[PDB]
Assembly symmetry: C3
Homo-oligomer: 180 residues x 3
Protein backbone atom coordinates (compact mmCIF):
# COMPACT_ATOMS: atom_id res chain seq x y z
CA UNK A 1 0.00 0.00 0.00
CA UNK A 2 0.90 3.70 -0.12
CA UNK A 3 2.37 5.77 2.72
CA UNK A 4 2.32 9.54 2.26
CA UNK A 5 5.37 11.50 3.35
CA UNK A 6 5.21 15.31 3.26
CA UNK A 7 8.39 17.38 2.80
CA UNK A 8 9.07 21.12 2.59
CA UNK A 9 12.01 22.23 0.47
CA UNK A 10 13.31 25.75 0.95
CA UNK A 11 16.12 27.76 -0.58
CA UNK A 12 17.34 29.74 2.45
CA UNK A 13 19.86 31.60 0.27
CA UNK A 14 22.81 30.18 2.20
CA UNK A 15 24.09 27.30 0.04
CA UNK A 16 25.21 29.25 -3.07
CA UNK A 17 22.30 27.60 -4.89
CA UNK A 18 21.23 27.27 -7.64
CA UNK A 19 23.93 27.59 -10.30
CA UNK A 20 22.38 28.57 -13.63
CA UNK A 21 24.57 27.49 -16.56
CA UNK A 22 23.32 29.18 -19.76
CA UNK A 23 24.54 26.47 -22.16
CA UNK A 24 21.40 26.53 -24.36
CA UNK A 25 22.92 29.66 -25.85
CA UNK A 26 19.62 31.15 -27.05
CA UNK A 27 19.44 34.96 -27.45
CA UNK A 28 16.59 37.47 -27.60
CA UNK A 29 16.29 39.47 -30.85
CA UNK A 30 17.16 43.15 -30.46
CA UNK A 31 18.57 42.87 -26.93
CA UNK A 32 20.78 39.77 -27.24
CA UNK A 33 19.64 38.84 -23.71
CA UNK A 34 19.85 35.24 -22.66
CA UNK A 35 16.68 33.30 -23.30
CA UNK A 36 16.05 30.12 -21.29
CA UNK A 37 16.16 27.19 -23.67
CA UNK A 38 16.88 23.52 -24.11
CA UNK A 39 20.29 22.74 -22.70
CA UNK A 40 20.66 25.34 -19.98
CA UNK A 41 21.75 23.28 -16.91
CA UNK A 42 21.00 23.96 -13.23
CA UNK A 43 22.82 22.18 -10.39
CA UNK A 44 21.13 22.89 -7.07
CA UNK A 45 20.84 21.98 -3.39
CA UNK A 46 18.23 23.24 -0.92
CA UNK A 47 17.23 22.43 2.69
CA UNK A 48 14.38 20.11 3.60
CA UNK A 49 12.07 20.05 6.60
CA UNK A 50 9.29 17.73 7.75
CA UNK A 51 5.59 18.39 7.13
CA UNK A 52 5.14 20.06 10.55
CA UNK A 53 8.00 22.48 9.73
CA UNK A 54 9.43 21.74 13.20
CA UNK A 55 12.29 19.46 12.10
CA UNK A 56 15.27 20.04 9.80
CA UNK A 57 15.66 16.77 7.92
CA UNK A 58 18.51 17.37 5.52
CA UNK A 59 18.96 18.67 1.96
CA UNK A 60 18.02 18.11 -1.66
CA UNK A 61 20.82 17.72 -4.19
CA UNK A 62 20.82 17.32 -7.95
CA UNK A 63 20.63 18.63 -11.48
CA UNK A 64 17.92 20.14 -13.68
CA UNK A 65 18.16 20.13 -17.47
CA UNK A 66 16.13 22.95 -19.05
CA UNK A 67 13.86 21.56 -21.80
CA UNK A 68 11.61 24.42 -22.94
CA UNK A 69 10.47 27.93 -22.08
CA UNK A 70 6.85 29.02 -22.27
CA UNK A 71 6.13 32.73 -22.80
CA UNK A 72 2.41 32.11 -22.32
CA UNK A 73 2.90 30.41 -18.93
CA UNK A 74 5.91 32.56 -17.93
CA UNK A 75 8.18 29.70 -16.92
CA UNK A 76 10.14 26.64 -17.88
CA UNK A 77 9.97 22.87 -18.16
CA UNK A 78 12.98 21.05 -16.76
CA UNK A 79 13.91 17.39 -16.63
CA UNK A 80 15.22 16.78 -13.13
CA UNK A 81 17.27 14.23 -11.23
CA UNK A 82 17.78 14.76 -7.54
CA UNK A 83 17.80 13.15 -4.13
CA UNK A 84 16.35 13.99 -0.73
CA UNK A 85 18.63 13.31 2.24
CA UNK A 86 17.07 12.66 5.65
CA UNK A 87 20.17 12.17 7.85
CA UNK A 88 20.34 8.68 9.33
CA UNK A 89 16.89 7.79 7.98
CA UNK A 90 18.43 7.50 4.49
CA UNK A 91 17.59 9.07 1.14
CA UNK A 92 14.97 9.05 -1.60
CA UNK A 93 15.89 9.58 -5.29
CA UNK A 94 13.56 11.11 -7.87
CA UNK A 95 13.51 11.58 -11.66
CA UNK A 96 11.07 13.44 -13.86
CA UNK A 97 9.42 16.75 -14.67
CA UNK A 98 10.08 19.96 -12.76
CA UNK A 99 7.83 22.72 -14.12
CA UNK A 100 8.30 26.21 -12.69
CA UNK A 101 4.68 27.24 -13.26
CA UNK A 102 2.67 24.16 -12.22
CA UNK A 103 2.59 20.97 -10.18
CA UNK A 104 4.02 17.72 -11.53
CA UNK A 105 4.65 14.08 -10.59
CA UNK A 106 8.17 12.71 -10.31
CA UNK A 107 9.13 9.03 -10.34
CA UNK A 108 10.50 7.73 -7.05
CA UNK A 109 13.47 5.79 -8.35
CA UNK A 110 14.52 4.21 -5.05
CA UNK A 111 16.17 5.01 -1.75
CA UNK A 112 18.32 3.86 1.13
CA UNK A 113 17.99 3.27 4.85
CA UNK A 114 14.33 3.21 5.87
CA UNK A 115 13.56 4.01 2.22
CA UNK A 116 15.54 1.09 0.74
CA UNK A 117 13.43 -0.56 -1.95
CA UNK A 118 10.90 2.26 -2.16
CA UNK A 119 9.01 3.04 -5.33
CA UNK A 120 6.06 5.08 -6.54
CA UNK A 121 5.53 8.73 -7.47
CA UNK A 122 5.95 12.10 -5.75
CA UNK A 123 3.86 15.22 -6.29
CA UNK A 124 5.88 18.45 -6.56
CA UNK A 125 3.90 21.55 -5.63
CA UNK A 126 5.39 25.00 -6.22
CA UNK A 127 4.50 27.15 -3.22
CA UNK A 128 6.48 30.16 -4.36
CA UNK A 129 8.91 29.32 -7.13
CA UNK A 130 11.88 29.04 -6.63
CA UNK A 131 12.21 29.51 -2.87
CA UNK A 132 9.57 27.17 -1.40
CA UNK A 133 8.35 23.78 -2.66
CA UNK A 134 6.17 21.08 -1.11
CA UNK A 135 6.29 17.35 -1.88
CA UNK A 136 3.93 14.50 -1.29
CA UNK A 137 5.83 11.21 -1.64
CA UNK A 138 3.42 8.34 -2.32
CA UNK A 139 5.78 5.71 -1.00
CA UNK A 140 5.36 2.03 -1.72
CA UNK A 141 7.45 -0.99 -0.78
CA UNK A 142 8.76 0.00 2.65
CA UNK A 143 8.01 -0.61 6.31
CA UNK A 144 5.85 1.76 8.34
CA UNK A 145 7.42 5.23 8.49
CA UNK A 146 8.59 6.42 11.93
CA UNK A 147 6.13 8.69 13.73
CA UNK A 148 8.67 11.54 13.67
CA UNK A 149 8.21 11.81 9.90
CA UNK A 150 4.39 11.75 10.12
CA UNK A 151 3.56 14.71 12.35
CA UNK A 152 0.46 16.77 11.44
CA UNK A 153 1.26 18.65 8.26
CA UNK A 154 1.24 22.45 7.97
CA UNK A 155 -0.84 23.41 4.91
CA UNK A 156 1.45 25.00 2.32
CA UNK A 157 1.17 28.71 1.49
CA UNK A 158 3.73 31.35 0.48
CA UNK A 159 4.18 32.62 4.05
CA UNK A 160 5.06 29.31 5.71
CA UNK A 161 8.52 28.96 7.26
CA UNK A 162 10.50 26.47 9.33
CA UNK A 163 10.21 26.91 13.09
CA UNK A 164 13.05 29.00 14.53
CA UNK A 165 14.39 25.94 16.35
CA UNK A 166 14.47 23.96 13.09
CA UNK A 167 16.15 26.78 11.14
CA UNK A 168 18.73 26.92 13.94
CA UNK A 169 19.17 23.11 13.92
CA UNK A 170 18.59 22.84 17.66
CA UNK A 171 18.05 19.71 19.75
CA UNK A 172 14.61 18.16 19.32
CA UNK A 173 14.34 19.86 15.92
CA UNK A 174 16.69 17.87 13.72
CA UNK A 175 16.67 14.41 12.14
CA UNK A 176 19.32 12.10 13.66
CA UNK A 177 22.59 13.24 12.04
CA UNK A 178 20.57 15.49 9.75
CA UNK A 179 22.22 16.04 6.39
CA UNK A 180 24.23 19.25 6.23
Amino acid sequence: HVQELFVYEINERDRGSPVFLPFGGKKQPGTDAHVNSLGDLVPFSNKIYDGSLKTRLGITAGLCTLISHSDQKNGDRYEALYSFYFGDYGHISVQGPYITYEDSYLAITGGSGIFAGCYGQAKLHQIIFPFKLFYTFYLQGIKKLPEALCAPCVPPSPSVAPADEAKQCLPNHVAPNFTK
Copy 2:
Protein backbone atom coordinates in the same frame (compact mmCIF):
# COMPACT_ATOMS: atom_id res chain seq x y z
CA HIS B 1 3.39 -10.05 -15.71
CA VAL B 2 5.08 -8.06 -18.43
CA GLN B 3 3.11 -5.65 -20.63
CA GLU B 4 4.72 -4.50 -23.85
CA LEU B 5 4.39 -0.85 -24.86
CA PHE B 6 5.71 0.30 -28.24
CA VAL B 7 6.75 3.91 -28.78
CA TYR B 8 8.22 5.83 -31.73
CA GLU B 9 10.61 8.70 -30.98
CA ILE B 10 11.12 11.18 -33.80
CA ASN B 11 13.29 14.27 -34.03
CA GLU B 12 11.22 16.49 -36.30
CA ARG B 13 13.91 19.21 -36.27
CA ASP B 14 11.46 21.71 -34.77
CA ARG B 15 12.73 21.84 -31.18
CA GLY B 16 16.41 22.97 -31.59
CA SER B 17 17.35 19.47 -30.37
CA PRO B 18 19.80 17.99 -29.64
CA VAL B 19 22.14 20.54 -28.09
CA PHE B 20 25.67 19.17 -28.41
CA LEU B 21 27.96 20.55 -25.70
CA PRO B 22 31.57 19.65 -26.59
CA PHE B 23 32.85 19.61 -23.02
CA GLY B 24 35.07 16.56 -23.57
CA GLY B 25 37.31 19.06 -25.39
CA LYS B 26 38.86 16.63 -27.87
CA LYS B 27 39.89 17.39 -31.45
CA GLN B 28 41.13 15.23 -34.32
CA PRO B 29 44.92 15.49 -34.74
CA GLY B 30 45.64 16.82 -38.20
CA THR B 31 42.20 18.38 -38.83
CA ASP B 32 40.96 19.81 -35.50
CA ALA B 33 37.42 18.44 -36.16
CA HIS B 34 35.59 17.65 -32.94
CA VAL B 35 36.27 14.18 -31.60
CA ASN B 36 33.44 12.74 -29.51
CA SER B 37 34.84 11.91 -26.09
CA LEU B 38 34.01 11.31 -22.44
CA GLY B 39 32.25 14.36 -21.06
CA ASP B 40 30.58 15.81 -24.12
CA LEU B 41 27.00 16.46 -22.88
CA VAL B 42 23.81 16.32 -24.91
CA PRO B 43 20.51 17.75 -23.61
CA PHE B 44 17.66 16.69 -25.91
CA SER B 45 13.91 16.48 -26.39
CA ASN B 46 12.05 14.73 -29.27
CA LYS B 47 8.43 13.93 -30.07
CA ILE B 48 6.87 10.58 -29.31
CA TYR B 49 4.04 8.76 -31.07
CA ASP B 50 2.23 5.50 -30.34
CA GLY B 51 3.14 2.18 -31.98
CA SER B 52 0.52 2.57 -34.75
CA LEU B 53 1.95 6.02 -35.55
CA LYS B 54 -1.60 7.43 -35.52
CA THR B 55 -1.36 9.32 -32.23
CA ARG B 56 0.98 12.03 -30.94
CA LEU B 57 1.62 11.08 -27.28
CA GLY B 58 4.07 13.73 -26.07
CA ILE B 59 7.83 14.12 -25.82
CA THR B 60 11.09 12.70 -24.56
CA ALA B 61 13.26 14.99 -22.43
CA GLY B 62 16.64 14.46 -20.83
CA LEU B 63 20.40 14.41 -20.92
CA CYS B 64 23.03 12.12 -22.44
CA THR B 65 26.63 11.97 -21.23
CA LEU B 66 29.06 10.84 -23.93
CA ILE B 67 31.25 8.02 -22.55
CA SER B 68 33.39 6.78 -25.43
CA HIS B 69 33.81 6.82 -29.17
CA SER B 70 34.63 3.76 -31.21
CA ASP B 71 36.40 4.31 -34.52
CA GLN B 72 35.98 0.58 -35.23
CA LYS B 73 32.20 0.56 -34.75
CA ASN B 74 31.81 4.13 -36.10
CA GLY B 75 29.75 5.35 -33.18
CA ASP B 76 29.50 6.29 -29.53
CA ARG B 77 28.44 5.02 -26.13
CA TYR B 78 26.31 7.45 -24.12
CA GLU B 79 24.92 7.18 -20.61
CA ALA B 80 21.35 8.46 -20.81
CA LEU B 81 18.87 9.86 -18.30
CA TYR B 82 15.51 10.79 -19.72
CA SER B 83 11.75 10.55 -19.49
CA PHE B 84 8.86 9.85 -21.84
CA TYR B 85 5.78 12.08 -21.41
CA PHE B 86 2.36 10.81 -22.44
CA GLY B 87 0.15 13.80 -21.57
CA ASP B 88 -2.51 12.82 -19.01
CA TYR B 89 -1.44 9.15 -18.92
CA GLY B 90 1.70 10.21 -17.03
CA HIS B 91 5.39 9.57 -17.64
CA ILE B 92 8.03 6.84 -17.69
CA SER B 93 11.62 7.48 -16.62
CA VAL B 94 14.65 5.54 -17.89
CA GLN B 95 18.39 5.26 -17.20
CA GLY B 96 21.11 3.40 -19.01
CA PRO B 97 22.99 3.02 -22.27
CA TYR B 98 22.39 4.61 -25.65
CA ILE B 99 24.83 3.16 -28.18
CA THR B 100 24.66 4.87 -31.56
CA TYR B 101 25.49 1.68 -33.52
CA GLU B 102 23.38 -1.05 -31.82
CA ASP B 103 20.29 -1.79 -29.74
CA SER B 104 20.48 -1.53 -25.96
CA TYR B 105 18.36 -2.08 -22.88
CA LEU B 106 17.51 0.74 -20.49
CA ALA B 107 16.35 0.45 -16.89
CA ILE B 108 12.79 1.62 -16.33
CA THR B 109 13.31 3.60 -13.13
CA GLY B 110 9.67 4.42 -12.47
CA GLY B 111 6.79 6.57 -13.63
CA SER B 112 3.67 8.55 -12.81
CA GLY B 113 -0.04 8.38 -13.55
CA ILE B 114 -0.91 5.03 -15.15
CA PHE B 115 2.81 4.23 -14.95
CA ALA B 116 3.15 4.93 -11.22
CA GLY B 117 5.19 2.09 -9.65
CA CYS B 118 6.37 0.69 -12.99
CA TYR B 119 9.63 -1.22 -13.34
CA GLY B 120 11.48 -3.39 -15.84
CA GLN B 121 13.62 -2.74 -18.87
CA ALA B 122 13.10 -1.06 -22.25
CA LYS B 123 14.67 -1.98 -25.59
CA LEU B 124 16.05 0.96 -27.56
CA HIS B 125 16.20 0.32 -31.30
CA GLN B 126 17.59 2.99 -33.56
CA ILE B 127 15.92 3.18 -36.96
CA ILE B 128 17.76 6.25 -38.33
CA PHE B 129 20.75 7.81 -36.54
CA PRO B 130 19.78 9.82 -34.45
CA PHE B 131 16.44 11.09 -35.76
CA LYS B 132 14.15 8.04 -35.46
CA LEU B 133 14.04 5.42 -32.69
CA PHE B 134 11.65 2.65 -31.64
CA TYR B 135 11.16 1.50 -28.06
CA THR B 136 9.72 -1.61 -26.52
CA PHE B 137 8.94 -1.03 -22.83
CA TYR B 138 8.66 -4.33 -20.93
CA LEU B 139 6.49 -2.86 -18.20
CA GLN B 140 5.92 -4.58 -14.85
CA GLY B 141 4.02 -3.50 -11.74
CA ILE B 142 1.11 -1.59 -13.31
CA LYS B 143 -2.57 -2.03 -14.22
CA LYS B 144 -3.63 -3.15 -17.71
CA LEU B 145 -2.58 -0.48 -20.21
CA PRO B 146 -5.33 1.47 -21.98
CA GLU B 147 -6.17 -0.03 -25.41
CA ALA B 148 -5.37 3.38 -26.95
CA LEU B 149 -1.69 2.76 -26.12
CA CYS B 150 -1.87 -0.81 -27.51
CA ALA B 151 -3.02 -0.32 -31.12
CA PRO B 152 -1.49 -2.70 -33.69
CA CYS B 153 2.13 -1.63 -34.17
CA VAL B 154 3.60 -0.35 -37.45
CA PRO B 155 6.69 -2.49 -38.13
CA PRO B 156 9.82 -0.35 -37.68
CA SER B 157 11.72 0.58 -40.85
CA PRO B 158 13.60 3.66 -42.14
CA SER B 159 10.61 5.07 -44.04
CA VAL B 160 7.97 4.94 -41.28
CA ALA B 161 6.32 8.25 -40.46
CA PRO B 162 3.57 9.56 -38.19
CA ALA B 163 0.13 9.97 -39.75
CA ASP B 164 -0.44 13.51 -41.07
CA GLU B 165 -3.17 14.15 -38.49
CA ALA B 166 -0.86 13.03 -35.67
CA LYS B 167 2.00 15.13 -37.00
CA GLN B 168 -0.44 18.09 -37.12
CA CYS B 169 -1.66 17.44 -33.55
CA LEU B 170 -5.32 17.39 -34.62
CA PRO B 171 -7.77 16.94 -31.70
CA ASN B 172 -8.64 13.25 -32.32
CA HIS B 173 -5.03 12.22 -33.02
CA VAL B 174 -3.36 13.21 -29.77
CA ALA B 175 -3.13 11.71 -26.29
CA PRO B 176 -5.35 13.49 -23.76
CA ASN B 177 -3.55 16.78 -23.04
CA PHE B 178 -0.53 15.47 -24.96
CA THR B 179 2.80 16.81 -23.79
CA LYS B 180 4.00 19.73 -25.94
Copy 3:
Protein backbone atom coordinates in the same frame (compact mmCIF):
# COMPACT_ATOMS: atom_id res chain seq x y z
CA HIS C 1 14.94 -11.57 -0.27
CA VAL C 2 18.35 -9.94 -0.79
CA GLN C 3 21.30 -11.15 -2.91
CA GLU C 4 24.71 -9.60 -2.27
CA LEU C 5 26.86 -8.73 -5.28
CA PHE C 6 30.41 -7.48 -4.70
CA VAL C 7 32.09 -5.26 -7.32
CA TYR C 8 35.49 -3.54 -7.44
CA GLU C 9 35.74 -0.29 -9.40
CA ILE C 10 39.21 0.82 -10.50
CA ASN C 11 40.39 3.92 -12.32
CA GLU C 12 43.32 2.51 -14.28
CA ARG C 13 44.13 5.94 -15.78
CA ASP C 14 43.62 4.73 -19.35
CA ARG C 15 40.13 6.07 -20.19
CA GLY C 16 40.82 9.83 -19.78
CA SER C 17 38.58 9.80 -16.72
CA PRO C 18 37.34 11.67 -14.80
CA VAL C 19 36.62 14.83 -16.79
CA PHE C 20 36.40 17.69 -14.31
CA LEU C 21 34.24 20.57 -15.56
CA PRO C 22 34.76 23.56 -13.21
CA PHE C 23 31.31 25.08 -13.83
CA GLY C 24 30.81 26.07 -10.16
CA GLY C 25 33.08 28.98 -11.09
CA LYS C 26 34.71 29.32 -7.67
CA LYS C 27 38.29 30.51 -7.33
CA GLN C 28 40.74 31.20 -4.50
CA PRO C 29 40.94 34.86 -3.28
CA GLY C 30 44.46 35.51 -4.63
CA THR C 31 45.52 32.46 -6.67
CA ASP C 32 42.43 32.14 -8.90
CA ALA C 33 43.03 28.40 -8.38
CA HIS C 34 39.97 26.16 -8.42
CA VAL C 35 37.77 25.69 -5.40
CA ASN C 36 35.35 22.76 -5.62
CA SER C 37 31.79 24.07 -5.38
CA LEU C 38 28.16 23.40 -6.26
CA GLY C 39 27.80 23.04 -10.00
CA ASP C 40 31.16 21.59 -10.94
CA LEU C 41 30.27 18.56 -13.12
CA VAL C 42 32.23 15.33 -13.46
CA PRO C 43 31.55 12.84 -16.29
CA PHE C 44 33.41 9.58 -15.60
CA SER C 45 33.95 5.96 -16.55
CA ASN C 46 36.06 3.34 -14.73
CA LYS C 47 36.67 -0.40 -15.01
CA ILE C 48 34.84 -2.96 -12.89
CA TYR C 49 35.98 -6.36 -11.66
CA ASP C 50 34.24 -9.13 -9.69
CA GLY C 51 34.60 -9.59 -5.92
CA SER C 52 37.35 -12.20 -6.34
CA LEU C 53 39.29 -9.71 -8.53
CA LYS C 54 39.88 -12.52 -11.05
CA THR C 55 37.41 -11.28 -13.68
CA ARG C 56 37.09 -8.04 -15.67
CA LEU C 57 33.32 -7.50 -15.86
CA GLY C 58 32.98 -4.18 -17.68
CA ILE C 59 32.81 -0.51 -16.80
CA THR C 60 30.99 2.17 -14.86
CA ALA C 61 29.68 5.20 -16.76
CA GLY C 62 27.93 8.35 -15.67
CA LEU C 63 27.93 11.85 -14.30
CA CYS C 64 28.50 13.42 -10.89
CA THR C 65 27.27 16.85 -9.83
CA LEU C 66 29.44 18.42 -7.12
CA ILE C 67 27.19 19.65 -4.28
CA SER C 68 29.48 20.91 -1.54
CA HIS C 69 33.07 20.97 -0.38
CA SER C 70 34.09 20.42 3.23
CA ASP C 71 37.36 21.95 4.42
CA GLN C 72 36.92 20.24 7.81
CA LYS C 73 36.51 16.79 6.24
CA ASN C 74 38.90 17.51 3.34
CA GLY C 75 36.47 16.27 0.70
CA ASP C 76 33.32 16.71 -1.34
CA ARG C 77 29.73 15.62 -1.59
CA TYR C 78 28.56 14.67 -5.07
CA GLU C 79 25.18 13.62 -6.41
CA ALA C 80 25.82 10.71 -8.75
CA LEU C 81 23.96 9.12 -11.65
CA TYR C 82 25.73 6.13 -13.19
CA SER C 83 25.45 2.58 -14.44
CA PHE C 84 27.53 -0.58 -14.03
CA TYR C 85 27.96 -2.63 -17.23
CA PHE C 86 28.59 -6.37 -16.91
CA GLY C 87 28.95 -7.35 -20.58
CA ASP C 88 26.27 -9.83 -21.64
CA TYR C 89 24.90 -10.15 -18.07
CA GLY C 90 23.31 -6.70 -18.39
CA HIS C 91 23.58 -3.50 -16.37
CA ILE C 92 22.60 -2.01 -13.03
CA SER C 93 21.75 1.70 -12.67
CA VAL C 94 22.26 3.72 -9.49
CA GLN C 95 21.40 7.18 -8.15
CA GLY C 96 22.51 8.87 -4.96
CA PRO C 97 25.40 10.25 -2.94
CA TYR C 98 29.14 9.87 -3.50
CA ILE C 99 31.04 11.44 -0.61
CA THR C 100 34.80 11.40 -1.07
CA TYR C 101 35.59 10.95 2.63
CA GLU C 102 33.04 8.33 3.80
CA ASP C 103 30.85 5.37 2.78
CA SER C 104 27.34 5.96 1.44
CA TYR C 105 24.31 4.08 0.10
CA LEU C 106 23.04 4.52 -3.44
CA ALA C 107 19.57 3.67 -4.73
CA ILE C 108 19.52 0.77 -7.20
CA THR C 109 17.15 2.28 -9.75
CA GLY C 110 16.86 -0.78 -11.99
CA GLY C 111 18.76 -2.81 -14.54
CA SER C 112 18.68 -5.03 -17.60
CA GLY C 113 19.50 -8.61 -18.52
CA ILE C 114 19.89 -10.75 -15.38
CA PHE C 115 19.32 -7.51 -13.45
CA ALA C 116 16.01 -6.59 -15.12
CA GLY C 117 13.54 -5.47 -12.44
CA CYS C 118 16.17 -5.16 -9.72
CA TYR C 119 15.75 -2.79 -6.80
CA GLY C 120 17.31 -2.04 -3.43
CA GLN C 121 20.39 -0.17 -2.26
CA ALA C 122 24.14 -0.43 -2.81
CA LYS C 123 26.91 0.39 -0.36
CA LEU C 124 29.77 2.45 -1.80
CA HIS C 125 33.05 2.01 0.11
CA GLN C 126 36.17 3.90 -0.87
CA ILE C 127 39.31 1.77 -0.84
CA ILE C 128 41.74 4.50 -1.82
CA PHE C 129 40.93 8.03 -2.94
CA PRO C 130 40.60 8.62 -5.77
CA PHE C 131 41.29 5.38 -7.71
CA LYS C 132 39.64 2.32 -6.08
CA LEU C 133 36.13 1.70 -4.75
CA PHE C 134 34.24 -1.39 -3.54
CA TYR C 135 30.49 -1.89 -3.82
CA THR C 136 28.02 -4.19 -2.14
CA PHE C 137 24.78 -4.34 -4.11
CA TYR C 138 21.88 -5.58 -1.96
CA LEU C 139 19.85 -6.79 -4.92
CA GLN C 140 16.16 -7.55 -4.66
CA GLY C 141 13.63 -8.71 -7.24
CA ILE C 142 15.81 -10.87 -9.49
CA LYS C 143 16.64 -14.53 -10.13
CA LYS C 144 19.56 -16.28 -8.42
CA LEU C 145 22.81 -14.68 -9.60
CA PRO C 146 25.12 -16.82 -11.73
CA GLU C 147 27.93 -18.51 -9.77
CA ALA C 148 30.57 -16.62 -11.78
CA LEU C 149 29.36 -13.37 -10.12
CA CYS C 150 29.34 -14.89 -6.61
CA ALA C 151 32.92 -16.12 -6.16
CA PRO C 152 34.59 -15.74 -2.73
CA CYS C 153 35.23 -12.03 -2.20
CA VAL C 154 38.68 -10.53 -1.66
CA PRO C 155 38.37 -8.54 1.60
CA PRO C 156 38.67 -4.85 0.71
CA SER C 157 41.93 -3.14 1.70
CA PRO C 158 44.19 -0.44 0.15
CA SER C 159 46.60 -2.93 -1.47
CA VAL C 160 44.04 -5.01 -3.41
CA ALA C 161 44.26 -5.01 -7.21
CA PRO C 162 42.91 -7.08 -10.12
CA ALA C 163 44.71 -10.29 -11.08
CA ASP C 164 47.16 -9.58 -13.93
CA GLU C 165 45.13 -11.92 -16.17
CA ALA C 166 41.95 -9.90 -15.52
CA LYS C 167 43.80 -6.63 -16.09
CA GLN C 168 45.05 -8.00 -19.42
CA CYS C 169 41.50 -9.20 -20.27
CA LEU C 170 42.72 -12.73 -20.93
CA PRO C 171 40.55 -15.81 -21.54
CA ASN C 172 38.95 -17.23 -18.40
CA HIS C 173 39.19 -13.75 -16.85
CA VAL C 174 36.48 -11.74 -18.59
CA ALA C 175 32.69 -11.57 -18.43
CA PRO C 176 30.96 -12.79 -21.63
CA ASN C 177 31.50 -9.95 -24.08
CA PHE C 178 32.74 -7.80 -21.18
CA THR C 179 31.95 -4.12 -21.63
CA LYS C 180 34.90 -2.19 -23.06
